[PDB]
């Protein structure tokens, strides 16, 4: 059970709800490995329930650094607290699929009722939504995702290197 999916991206955060589980035991097979390439069958697995866009490139760079060093930011806290059901912390946590095994501990530090999965099943679910991108989102974001990617990559790199224009 891989119930929800968290995809971080330069325009904002997306929470998807996993409709159908993919196969666990047959996860290396040919048909299971190329159903994430076919879009007509990937939309049988993944459904978008929420997308919180960023306030601009400033909050984009803040959340890019927080996602980079593995911390839950305030917009993450907001969207996860909106979307994930108040499960128990001792019996059957709600299962969130992330792509970052050291972002998981920061998610359970804030929501103890959430167990986080990033193994190969969550990895290829995540790369399915990365492979399709703008088609899953049904038209609900401002800004082209690759244009925001160019801006965020340049901003992240100049921040990380302390590029001064003086």
């Amino acid at each position: 059970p891989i119930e929800y999916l968290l995809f971080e991206e330069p325009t904002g955060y997306a929470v998807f709800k996993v409709k159908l589980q993919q196969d666990d035991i047959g996860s290396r097979l040919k048909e299971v490995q190329e159903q994430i390439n076919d879009f007509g069958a990937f939309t049988k697995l993944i459904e978008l329930v929420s997308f919180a866009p960023f306030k601009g490139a400033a909050e984009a760079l803040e959340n890019a650094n927080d996602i980079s060093e593995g911390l839950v930011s305030e917009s993450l806290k907001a969207i996860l607290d909106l979307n994930l059901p108040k499960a128990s912390s001792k019996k059957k946590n709600i299962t969130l699929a992330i792509s970052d095994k050291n972002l998981g501990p920061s998610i359970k530090e804030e929501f103890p009722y959430v167990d986080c999965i990033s193994n190969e099943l969550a990895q290829d679910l995540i790369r399915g939504v990365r492979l399709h991108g703008e088609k899953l989102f049904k038209g609900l974001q401002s800004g082209d995702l690759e244009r925001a990617q160019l801006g965020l990559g340049h901003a992240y790199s100049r921040a990380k290197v302390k590029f001064s224009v003086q």
Binding site: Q22, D23, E31, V32, E34, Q35, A41, K44
Partner: peptide, 11 residues
């Protein structure tokens, strides 16, 4: 268990 059955998700 079913030999002719594949394990992809189906339209």
């Amino acid at each position: 268990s079913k030999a002719w059955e594949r394990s992809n998700v189906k339209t």
